[PDB]
Amino acid sequence: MLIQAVGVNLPPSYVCLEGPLGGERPRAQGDEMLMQRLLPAVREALDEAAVKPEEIDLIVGLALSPDHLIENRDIMAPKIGHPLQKVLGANRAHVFDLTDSSLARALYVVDTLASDQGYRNVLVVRGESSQGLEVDSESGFALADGALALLCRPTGKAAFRRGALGGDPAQEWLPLSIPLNTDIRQVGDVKGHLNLPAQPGLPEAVRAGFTRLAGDFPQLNWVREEWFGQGRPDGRCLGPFELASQLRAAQRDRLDELLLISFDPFGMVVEGVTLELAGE
Amino acid sequence: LYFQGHMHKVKLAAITCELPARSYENDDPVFAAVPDLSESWWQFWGVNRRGYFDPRNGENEFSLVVRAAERLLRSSDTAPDSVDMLICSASSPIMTDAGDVLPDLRGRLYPRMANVLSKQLGLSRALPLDSQMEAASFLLNLRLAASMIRQGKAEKVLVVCSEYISNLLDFTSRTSTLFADGCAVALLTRGDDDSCDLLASAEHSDATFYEVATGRWRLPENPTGEAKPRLYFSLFSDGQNKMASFVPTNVPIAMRRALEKAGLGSDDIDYFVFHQPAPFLVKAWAEGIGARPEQYQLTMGDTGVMISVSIPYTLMTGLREGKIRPGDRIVMAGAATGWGFAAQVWQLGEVLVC
């Protein structure tokens, strides 16, 4: 899997939440919806790589948001990859979604599929516009809002790792869940609640897990997702969207290869994928 | 001269389905609030009865998959720890049960099924994955599984499709009359000979008519009292009429592409397995590729339109009834909202039906 270009578009509005899993994260406001961020992110990645939308062979999306996806804020399915195909003009592309998967696992799966099918230009997009989800007030956990677009060229050579979190190996980490809202009265009410029990040692466990997984590829520099504000400057974090600045930094330093590590809050594991980089 | 690389063969080893216990006739009181019902409407779509999961009796998207998966693993003598990957699909964003893994979790949007199911079944080495292509999800999961097996990244892949679509149906609308619930489980492995392989596949999408068939948070179409909003399957009457010729032709396009990649023609195919949206659609697809009525089955009569489970159920039906035999070369194809289209050309060996 080769990363041709990276696009990212985040809301300027940051919201701080207190708690062991809290932090200052970007948050969509009012009736803003994901496509407002996703399309420009995709378009800047396409322009960087000099790839036209009709050249896109595959679009794979990742978005938990149950609403605020497109112009009709009430639609939840089919998932955003399809309306992206329409407004983008990728008339030759195949579209599907990998739901609650991490980015690292998705890139691994897509590199396997796309190389097998002979695709040359693949688009993996990650985005959130989470007005429809109530944050976890007790722990402070919330999803960062924004859009990330990775324009990729498959090679079939990406390696993959699914590793455990660090810290106490005997400790059972309580996973993230998004239960359905059982008392929806207005169409604009939240559709689900973020539920991630307060676990003070979790942010360090994820980072320790990152370092352990990176030990399987000691020859590679690596990038990571930061889902929590604990220990971060200003308590600010962008979740999976942190990858944009790190990947751009890797391009600036002329790195050929790279390891990208994600955090899966549903499985309470870390997942890494090896990638190739283009110059920039 | 050097030697050419060779991808591993993909064996479709086992398949099973698990349908709801209860059936509902077209005159069942569940449709009492449905307007514009006529005897011609029922005859056109070819659905006589369908099944809905009854959560009170313990039936849900998860419980019936555990039964179907445990039965297939037991009948095929597959050790849980030998499964390298688990790929699940569920078209309804609303899930309801997580077994013993998350006993206190009720209606939910996330997590999906793969990770929880792998723990329920003891798939201790399985990479869990949850994919979404609506009615084409079973073909998508076979494509993903096949590519992993072909490139040596997995030797056993368990594929799951569980459709609890009834929890999205608005029974004050005709939209609730066709769809139905059901589950399917399949096992794909690295073939040890040439008897079974996925010869080629073709997938493509077109979002022109995306807004026609959606899942939208809204009130019932004809509510009564202080009705609450829910996630409902929603149909755009005025847009659906425009796409007249668009689904009938695009499945053949996918079938033609896949046969072209496989180096075969329609004459080289023994049987066909189509998605089951409507009798007129299946016949249009079959006629668009040159398939004769004796080369495929219509199965929506007693099950309804089970989204992604219709294809695997029809495949299982053809196998169980002897219409699909070992050594046969078949084509599987269907359409899905989005919209998406997928076709696969299979060389089949012996497939365990359980």
XYZ file of C-alpha atoms in Angstrom:
634
model
C 0.000 0.000 0.000
C 1.480 3.316 -1.144
C 0.111 6.621 0.164
C -0.054 8.995 -2.809
C -1.494 11.978 -0.932
C -3.187 12.937 2.325
C -6.154 15.264 2.723
C -7.522 16.554 6.010
C -10.205 19.069 6.957
C -11.109 19.631 10.603
C -13.605 22.032 12.188
C -11.990 25.075 13.829
C -14.318 24.728 16.832
C -12.707 22.861 19.731
C -14.605 21.589 22.769
C -12.940 20.626 26.046
C -14.210 17.769 28.200
C -12.866 16.924 31.642
C -12.175 13.417 32.868
C -9.387 10.846 32.659
C -10.311 10.171 29.019
C -11.129 13.795 28.211
C -9.397 16.394 26.114
C -9.830 19.315 23.753
C -11.081 17.929 20.435
C -12.610 19.378 17.255
C -16.404 19.338 17.282
C -18.872 19.996 14.474
C -21.385 22.737 15.240
C -25.035 23.323 14.464
C -26.189 21.591 11.305
C -22.703 21.184 9.858
C -22.384 17.764 8.232
C -19.513 15.524 7.240
C -19.560 16.048 3.467
C -18.767 19.727 4.086
C -15.383 18.556 5.401
C -14.944 15.313 3.454
C -15.186 16.630 -0.106
C -12.495 19.343 0.289
C -10.245 16.835 2.073
C -10.643 14.377 -0.806
C -10.164 17.106 -3.396
C -6.924 18.392 -1.870
C -5.532 14.845 -1.784
C -6.538 14.281 -5.415
C -4.942 17.579 -6.465
C -1.693 16.800 -4.643
C -1.423 13.456 -6.465
C -2.608 14.877 -9.822
C -5.314 12.186 -9.910
C -8.722 12.968 -11.376
C -11.911 11.688 -9.693
C -12.841 9.453 -12.640
C -9.514 7.629 -12.164
C -10.612 6.403 -8.710
C -11.086 2.626 -8.760
C -12.242 2.099 -5.161
C -13.757 4.170 -2.352
C -13.841 2.757 1.188
C -15.302 4.840 4.008
C -15.149 4.823 7.802
C -17.660 6.918 9.742
C -19.508 6.149 12.975
C -21.746 9.242 12.839
C -25.410 8.114 12.685
C -26.545 11.373 11.046
C -25.211 14.759 9.887
C -23.492 12.965 7.010
C -24.874 14.752 3.927
C -27.175 17.582 2.829
C -30.091 15.603 4.274
C -28.895 15.494 7.883
C -31.396 12.735 8.729
C -29.980 10.056 6.391
C -27.781 7.343 7.881
C -27.526 4.765 5.064
C -26.286 3.972 2.489
C -23.014 5.139 4.008
C -21.142 8.241 2.988
C -18.879 6.575 0.426
C -21.771 6.522 -2.042
C -22.825 10.212 -1.879
C -19.097 10.933 -2.070
C -18.964 9.047 -5.379
C -21.827 11.139 -6.751
C -20.591 14.641 -5.918
C -16.983 13.655 -6.643
C -17.645 12.195 -10.097
C -15.806 8.877 -9.594
C -18.037 7.081 -12.075
C -15.733 4.041 -12.416
C -15.299 3.421 -8.681
C -16.485 0.580 -6.475
C -17.862 1.702 -3.103
C -18.210 -0.115 0.209
C -17.767 0.536 3.926
C -15.822 -1.101 6.753
C -17.968 0.312 9.600
C -16.203 0.254 12.989
C -12.846 -0.904 11.638
C -9.640 0.915 12.460
C -7.772 2.722 9.709
C -4.798 0.339 9.878
C -6.981 -2.743 9.436
C -8.949 -1.079 6.636
C -5.774 -0.126 4.763
C -4.514 -3.706 5.094
C -7.782 -5.216 3.862
C -8.126 -2.702 1.022
C -4.531 -3.232 -0.121
C -5.269 -6.967 -0.292
C -8.516 -6.501 -2.230
C -7.348 -3.706 -4.521
C -4.044 -5.313 -5.547
C -5.847 -8.586 -6.258
C -8.342 -6.779 -8.512
C -5.642 -4.679 -10.204
C -6.858 -1.278 -9.011
C -4.366 1.585 -9.347
C -5.998 4.495 -7.456
C -7.794 3.773 -4.179
C -9.455 6.239 -1.812
C -9.814 5.449 1.902
C -11.720 8.102 3.861
C -12.323 8.545 7.594
C -14.693 11.167 8.942
C -16.990 12.154 11.776
C -19.714 14.769 12.328
C -20.906 13.558 15.730
C -23.754 15.910 16.688
C -25.966 12.811 16.811
C -23.861 11.141 19.507
C -23.819 12.180 23.160
C -20.320 12.270 24.635
C -19.396 10.311 27.766
C -19.589 13.010 30.444
C -18.282 10.724 33.202
C -15.006 9.778 31.509
C -14.813 12.736 29.123
C -14.331 10.575 26.043
C -15.570 11.970 22.736
C -14.951 11.498 19.025
C -12.903 14.081 17.163
C -14.825 15.521 14.217
C -13.370 16.053 10.769
C -12.393 14.190 7.634
C -9.265 12.338 6.532
C -8.653 11.185 2.958
C -5.882 8.788 1.931
C -5.373 8.387 -1.817
C -3.523 5.095 -2.113
C -1.950 2.871 -4.736
C -2.208 -0.796 -3.706
C 0.790 -3.113 -3.815
C -0.373 -6.187 -1.872
C 2.806 -5.965 0.210
C 1.437 -4.231 3.315
C 2.157 -6.130 6.516
C -0.340 -6.044 9.374
C -0.249 -6.474 13.147
C -3.000 -6.627 15.784
C -1.464 -6.090 19.213
C -2.496 -5.858 22.849
C -2.582 -2.728 24.968
C 0.246 -2.115 27.419
C 0.111 -1.548 31.143
C -1.134 -4.317 33.431
C -1.572 -7.445 31.266
C -4.006 -8.867 33.837
C -6.265 -5.811 33.564
C -9.394 -6.279 31.452
C -10.051 -3.043 29.565
C -13.696 -2.030 29.215
C -14.458 -1.418 25.523
C -16.252 1.455 23.856
C -19.917 0.957 23.010
C -22.495 3.229 21.389
C -25.924 2.118 22.664
C -29.008 3.328 20.833
C -30.969 6.234 22.301
C -34.139 4.640 23.679
C -36.087 7.920 24.048
C -35.844 9.733 20.716
C -38.550 12.420 20.608
C -37.339 14.814 17.893
C -35.582 13.910 14.648
C -32.709 16.141 15.756
C -32.152 14.390 19.082
C -29.000 12.354 19.574
C -29.240 8.836 18.160
C -26.694 7.172 20.459
C -24.509 7.648 23.515
C -20.743 7.243 23.696
C -20.017 4.838 26.556
C -16.352 4.370 27.507
C -15.928 3.807 31.269
C -13.396 6.013 33.019
C -10.060 4.164 33.103
C -7.164 6.415 34.180
C -4.437 4.106 32.864
C -5.956 3.593 29.413
C -4.258 6.466 27.504
C -0.805 5.279 28.590
C -1.755 1.654 27.882
C -2.572 2.600 24.279
C 0.737 4.427 23.848
C 2.628 1.525 25.413
C 0.772 -0.772 23.025
C 1.865 1.436 20.128
C 5.518 1.154 21.148
C 5.311 -2.632 21.543
C 3.714 -3.116 18.119
C 6.318 -0.831 16.538
C 8.941 -3.249 17.898
C 7.891 -5.734 15.208
C 9.229 -3.306 12.560
C 12.292 -1.714 14.195
C 13.547 -0.525 10.795
C 10.471 1.695 10.315
C 9.510 5.093 11.625
C 5.877 5.210 12.692
C 2.811 7.418 13.107
C -0.058 7.040 15.564
C -3.592 8.085 16.478
C -4.130 10.138 19.654
C -7.634 9.553 21.029
C -7.042 11.085 24.477
C -5.820 14.402 25.815
C -4.014 13.037 28.864
C -0.356 14.039 28.689
C -0.787 15.870 25.403
C 0.099 19.560 24.939
C -2.885 21.725 25.930
C -4.848 18.509 26.428
C -5.636 18.669 22.710
C -5.929 15.613 20.474
C -7.395 14.874 17.048
C -7.972 11.118 17.255
C -7.222 9.371 13.958
C -6.884 12.793 12.314
C -3.484 13.249 13.996
C -2.122 11.056 11.204
C -2.341 13.934 8.711
C 0.363 16.125 10.250
C 2.637 13.130 10.929
C 2.297 11.778 7.376
C 2.954 15.258 5.975
C 6.043 15.443 8.191
C 7.166 12.075 6.825
C 6.799 13.363 3.260
C 8.708 16.519 4.206
C 11.587 14.339 5.483
C 11.624 12.099 2.349
C 10.708 8.836 4.074
C 10.040 5.952 1.690
C 8.355 3.529 4.111
C 6.307 4.027 7.263
C 4.334 2.140 9.911
C 0.862 3.503 10.737
C -0.682 2.417 14.048
C -4.353 2.808 14.972
C -6.292 2.336 18.199
C -9.487 0.265 18.093
C -11.650 1.363 21.061
C -14.218 -1.342 20.297
C -11.713 -4.205 20.472
C -9.374 -2.504 22.956
C -6.362 -3.351 20.796
C -3.862 -1.481 18.639
C -3.415 -2.285 14.952
C -0.519 -1.360 12.685
C 0.038 -1.496 8.930
C 3.225 -0.954 6.917
C 2.994 1.558 4.085
C 5.049 3.163 1.333
C 5.258 6.934 0.901
C 5.488 9.304 -2.050
C 7.637 12.417 -2.057
C 6.304 15.826 -1.047
C 13.287 -18.171 -18.006
C 11.654 -17.428 -14.655
C 8.485 -18.891 -13.157
C 5.115 -17.184 -12.813
C 3.564 -16.644 -9.411
C 0.342 -18.499 -8.684
C -2.471 -17.508 -6.336
C -3.916 -20.151 -4.044
C -7.235 -21.725 -4.972
C -10.294 -20.614 -3.000
C -12.515 -23.448 -1.761
C -16.124 -22.761 -0.762
C -16.079 -25.440 1.917
C -19.375 -25.160 3.789
C -22.517 -23.039 3.916
C -25.608 -22.859 6.115
C -28.550 -20.563 6.777
C -30.802 -19.869 9.748
C -34.220 -18.340 9.144
C -36.849 -17.020 11.572
C -39.152 -19.583 13.143
C -42.362 -17.644 12.482
C -43.824 -16.864 9.061
C -46.244 -14.052 8.227
C -48.800 -14.369 5.440
C -49.678 -11.442 3.193
C -52.935 -11.094 5.172
C -51.175 -11.164 8.552
C -52.360 -8.429 10.958
C -48.831 -6.985 10.988
C -49.787 -5.252 7.716
C -53.129 -3.958 9.022
C -51.901 -0.350 8.847
C -50.327 -0.670 5.376
C -52.146 1.370 2.695
C -52.445 0.742 -1.043
C -52.348 -3.043 -0.646
C -53.891 -5.007 -3.518
C -53.865 -8.593 -4.736
C -51.921 -7.443 -7.803
C -49.233 -5.910 -5.575
C -48.590 -9.230 -3.828
C -48.489 -11.175 -7.098
C -46.005 -8.771 -8.691
C -43.262 -9.015 -6.051
C -43.674 -12.770 -5.592
C -43.532 -12.758 -1.783
C -46.177 -15.016 -0.227
C -44.835 -15.223 3.331
C -41.793 -13.990 5.234
C -40.122 -14.357 8.617
C -39.277 -11.785 11.277
C -36.943 -12.272 14.224
C -38.918 -12.581 17.470
C -36.628 -11.140 20.179
C -39.043 -12.197 22.939
C -38.405 -15.846 21.922
C -34.645 -15.185 21.879
C -34.267 -14.664 18.116
C -32.023 -11.796 17.046
C -29.224 -11.085 14.590
C -26.667 -12.515 17.036
C -28.319 -15.565 18.611
C -29.227 -17.193 15.287
C -25.739 -16.571 13.891
C -24.191 -18.321 16.903
C -26.465 -21.304 16.240
C -25.678 -21.318 12.521
C -21.934 -20.801 12.999
C -21.578 -23.407 15.756
C -23.504 -25.880 13.596
C -21.244 -25.281 10.591
C -18.017 -25.476 12.607
C -19.256 -28.696 14.211
C -20.391 -30.317 10.953
C -17.214 -29.373 9.068
C -14.949 -30.373 11.983
C -13.354 -26.922 12.010
C -11.474 -26.035 15.183
C -12.371 -22.499 16.354
C -8.699 -21.528 16.713
C -8.050 -22.505 13.073
C -10.164 -19.637 11.683
C -7.833 -16.872 10.498
C -10.454 -14.229 9.714
C -14.121 -13.477 10.378
C -15.996 -11.133 8.032
C -19.505 -10.082 9.065
C -22.179 -7.929 7.455
C -25.497 -6.666 8.804
C -27.512 -4.176 6.761
C -29.480 -2.852 9.742
C -27.385 -0.280 11.662
C -29.316 -1.308 14.801
C -28.047 -4.384 16.635
C -29.696 -5.817 19.713
C -27.687 -8.652 21.314
C -24.063 -9.454 22.138
C -24.411 -12.841 23.846
C -22.138 -13.496 26.804
C -19.426 -11.098 25.600
C -21.387 -7.926 26.465
C -24.396 -9.197 28.436
C -25.647 -5.770 29.587
C -25.684 -4.140 26.123
C -29.106 -3.749 24.489
C -29.977 -1.805 21.299
C -26.787 -0.390 19.831
C -25.256 1.197 16.759
C -21.733 -0.017 17.572
C -19.769 -2.155 17.937
C -20.684 -4.370 14.988
C -20.692 -8.173 15.128
C -17.315 -9.600 14.075
C -15.237 -8.952 17.201
C -17.968 -9.952 19.664
C -18.872 -13.046 17.639
C -15.258 -14.226 17.425
C -15.152 -14.192 21.230
C -18.488 -16.004 21.574
C -17.332 -18.766 19.214
C -13.752 -18.962 20.470
C -12.128 -17.767 17.232
C -9.008 -16.882 19.200
C -6.836 -16.280 16.114
C -9.436 -14.674 13.836
C -9.093 -11.149 12.493
C -12.604 -9.666 12.850
C -13.948 -7.455 10.085
C -17.351 -5.866 9.485
C -18.211 -4.886 5.917
C -21.203 -3.124 4.386
C -22.530 -3.431 0.843
C -26.259 -3.988 1.682
C -27.760 -6.752 -0.502
C -24.373 -7.494 -2.111
C -22.544 -7.956 1.197
C -22.290 -11.730 0.872
C -20.508 -11.360 -2.468
C -18.307 -8.609 -1.019
C -17.280 -10.819 1.902
C -16.494 -13.724 -0.431
C -14.370 -11.351 -2.539
C -12.478 -10.121 0.533
C -12.035 -13.661 1.867
C -10.899 -14.889 -1.549
C -8.267 -12.164 -1.916
C -6.860 -12.899 1.542
C -6.708 -16.620 0.744
C -5.310 -16.063 -2.754
C -2.405 -13.987 -1.422
C -1.686 -16.433 1.418
C -2.789 -14.049 4.183
C -5.414 -16.490 5.492
C -6.159 -20.194 5.146
C -9.649 -20.327 6.700
C -12.169 -17.479 6.516
C -15.612 -17.537 8.134
C -18.207 -15.344 6.395
C -21.398 -14.163 8.109
C -24.462 -12.233 6.921
C -27.192 -11.414 9.445
C -30.151 -9.232 8.436
C -32.459 -7.838 11.128
C -34.097 -5.493 8.617
C -37.527 -5.793 10.265
C -36.437 -3.364 12.993
C -36.146 -0.695 10.261
C -39.463 -1.379 8.496
C -42.294 1.153 8.821
C -45.433 -0.989 9.042
C -47.551 2.063 8.192
C -46.054 1.944 4.663
C -45.917 -0.484 1.749
C -42.121 -0.411 2.124
C -42.537 -3.007 4.898
C -44.155 -5.674 2.698
C -41.097 -7.135 0.917
C -38.068 -7.285 3.214
C -37.483 -10.051 5.745
C -34.950 -11.330 8.266
C -32.460 -14.172 8.003
C -28.902 -15.312 8.587
C -26.213 -17.030 6.538
C -22.810 -18.476 7.437
C -20.158 -19.746 5.017
C -16.628 -21.137 5.323
C -13.916 -20.475 2.732
C -10.512 -22.154 2.830
C -7.343 -22.616 0.819
C -8.107 -25.313 -1.724
C -5.874 -28.374 -1.749
C -6.634 -29.139 -5.416
C -8.153 -27.638 -8.572
C -11.760 -28.623 -7.834
C -12.917 -25.286 -6.393
C -11.825 -21.715 -7.079
C -13.173 -18.201 -7.580
C -12.310 -17.680 -11.249
C -13.056 -13.943 -11.419
C -15.280 -11.205 -10.050
C -16.365 -7.702 -10.997
C -17.724 -5.012 -8.667
C -18.809 -1.478 -9.543
C -20.928 1.275 -8.019
C -23.048 4.192 -9.231
C -24.399 6.806 -6.811
C -26.710 8.581 -9.276
C -29.863 7.299 -7.538
C -28.386 7.163 -4.038
C -31.343 9.046 -2.533
C -33.938 6.527 -3.784
C -33.576 3.820 -1.109
C -32.177 5.022 2.208
C -32.276 4.515 5.943
C -33.450 7.817 7.386
C -34.416 8.991 10.851
C -38.049 10.047 10.483
C -41.557 9.623 11.823
C -43.793 6.835 10.492
C -45.336 7.498 7.092
C -48.876 7.436 8.549
C -48.341 7.819 12.299
C -50.927 7.487 15.038
C -50.763 9.384 18.304
C -47.468 10.784 19.569
C -45.268 8.497 17.487
C -41.530 8.589 18.105
C -38.929 9.004 15.341
C -37.054 5.854 14.349
C -34.495 4.690 11.800
C -36.750 3.607 8.937
C -36.186 2.253 5.456
C -37.310 5.112 3.206
C -38.267 5.080 -0.477
C -38.315 8.087 -2.825
C -41.250 7.304 -5.114
C -40.458 10.139 -7.534
C -36.805 9.160 -7.929
C -37.325 5.419 -8.205
C -39.539 5.972 -11.254
C -36.665 7.728 -13.056
C -34.182 4.832 -12.672
C -36.433 2.496 -14.699
C -33.749 0.700 -16.742
C -30.765 1.136 -14.432
C -30.782 -1.911 -12.123
C -31.874 -4.382 -14.853
C -28.828 -3.547 -17.010
C -26.049 -2.997 -14.454
C -26.097 -6.522 -12.980
C -25.546 -7.953 -16.496
C -22.732 -5.415 -16.926
C -21.098 -6.820 -13.797
C -21.718 -10.399 -14.947
C -20.226 -9.636 -18.365
C -17.123 -8.061 -16.812
C -16.555 -11.008 -14.464
C -17.009 -13.575 -17.239
C -14.633 -11.555 -19.420
C -11.976 -11.578 -16.689
C -12.508 -15.330 -16.268
C -12.079 -15.930 -20.003
C -15.520 -17.549 -20.166
C -18.895 -16.857 -21.724
C -22.485 -17.333 -20.651
C -22.470 -20.657 -22.534
C -19.765 -21.962 -20.160
C -21.958 -21.508 -17.064
C -24.045 -24.347 -15.643
C -26.222 -22.455 -13.153
C -26.907 -18.949 -11.858
C -27.612 -17.571 -8.377
C -29.216 -14.120 -8.341
C -30.290 -11.718 -5.644
C -34.047 -11.976 -5.073
C -35.538 -8.447 -5.171
C -38.437 -9.269 -7.500
C -39.295 -11.951 -10.089
C -39.226 -9.413 -12.933
C -35.761 -8.221 -11.896
C -34.277 -11.725 -11.711
C -35.676 -12.568 -15.146
C -34.379 -9.288 -16.579
C -30.895 -10.064 -15.228
C -31.074 -13.637 -16.529
C -32.270 -12.531 -19.963
C -29.589 -9.830 -20.033
C -26.876 -12.489 -19.765
C -28.478 -15.351 -21.716
C -29.614 -17.566 -18.836
C -32.593 -19.862 -19.371
C -35.355 -20.255 -16.768
C -34.116 -23.752 -15.893
C -30.691 -22.307 -14.965
C -31.761 -20.393 -11.830
C -34.329 -20.350 -9.034
C -36.727 -17.828 -7.522
C -36.656 -18.157 -3.737
C -38.414 -15.079 -2.318
C -41.749 -16.925 -2.169
C -41.457 -18.332 1.359
C -38.637 -16.165 2.772
C -39.127 -12.625 1.474
C -36.344 -10.305 0.362
C -33.648 -10.952 2.977
C -31.199 -8.331 1.661
C -27.723 -9.896 1.649
C -28.920 -13.354 2.776
C -31.026 -14.004 -0.338
C -27.976 -14.907 -2.459
C -26.404 -17.372 0.017
C -29.830 -18.880 0.685
C -30.463 -19.421 -3.035
C -26.986 -20.920 -3.406
C -27.681 -23.278 -0.504
C -31.098 -24.094 -1.984
C -29.622 -24.945 -5.382
C -27.011 -27.161 -3.745
C -29.497 -28.934 -1.473
C -31.914 -29.611 -4.351
C -29.221 -30.981 -6.663
C -29.606 -28.178 -9.219
C -26.026 -27.103 -8.424
C -23.696 -30.090 -8.575
C -19.997 -30.623 -7.817
C -17.874 -29.529 -10.742
C -20.465 -26.991 -11.893
C -19.402 -23.478 -12.869
C -21.892 -20.922 -11.584
C -22.307 -17.155 -11.579
C -23.493 -15.256 -8.503
C -24.706 -11.698 -9.005
C -26.952 -9.067 -7.490
C -27.610 -5.392 -6.906
C -27.597 -3.260 -3.777
C -28.620 0.201 -2.652
C -25.917 2.829 -2.944
C -25.976 1.688 -5.619
C -23.668 -1.280 -6.042
C -23.375 -4.269 -8.355
C -21.309 -7.433 -7.994
C -20.797 -10.642 -9.951
C -18.616 -13.673 -9.274
C -17.681 -16.631 -11.481
C -17.104 -19.749 -9.380
C -15.763 -23.209 -10.110
C -17.459 -25.306 -7.428
C -16.327 -28.592 -5.949
C -18.095 -30.409 -3.116
C -19.787 -27.912 -0.783
C -21.006 -29.090 2.611
C -24.570 -27.918 3.233
C -25.431 -27.977 6.932
